[PDB]
Amino acid sequence: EDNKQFFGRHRWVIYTTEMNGRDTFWDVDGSMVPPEWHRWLHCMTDDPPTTKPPTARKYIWTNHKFNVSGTPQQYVPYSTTRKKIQEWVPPSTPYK
C-alpha cells in the first residue's frame, strides 16, 4: 500500500508464483485473493488482516480455491433431492 497514490491505486497485491499446484508466474488471476485480504484490498475497509484478523470458525476453509472453471474441478449442477415415486418391485417368485 502507498497512501500518496490517488484512491484506487493506493493498495495493490503482487500475486504469488504458485498456488494449489498451478503455476501463476505468468498466469495471475483476479480470484487468487483470500477472503480476509479481499476485504482490505477492495477498499471495503481499512484494517489489514494482520492487524485485525477475521473471527475463526470451524467451517471456514483453510485453503482458498481460485476460479475452478475449465479445469477438471468444476461445479456440475445436479439434483440434491431424492426420488419421488417408488416403482413397485416385481416378485421374483416364479408364481403359479
Ligand X SMILES: CCCCCCCCCCCCCCCCCC(=O)OC[C@H](COP(=O)([O-])OCC[N+](C)(C)C)OC(=O)CCCCCCCCCCCCCCCCC
Task: Give the interface with another protein as residue ranges (CB under 8 A).
Answer: 3-9, 11-15, 27-31, 33-36, 38-39, 41-47, 54-55, 57-61, 64-65, 67, 69-70, 74-82
13 contributes a contact to ligand X by CB under 6 A: no
Q: How far apart are CA 54 and CA 34, in angstroms?
A: 12
Cα–chain center distance at 74: 11
Maximum alpha-carbon separation in the chain: 93
28 contributes a contact to ligand X by CB under 6 A: yes
User: Taking a C-beta distance cutoff of 8 angstroms, is the pair 40, 68 a contact?
Assistant: no
Q: Of the two residues 44 and 89, which places its CB atom closer to another protein in the complex? A: 44
Identified binder of ligand X from the candidate list 6, 26, 75, 95, rule CB under 6 A: 26
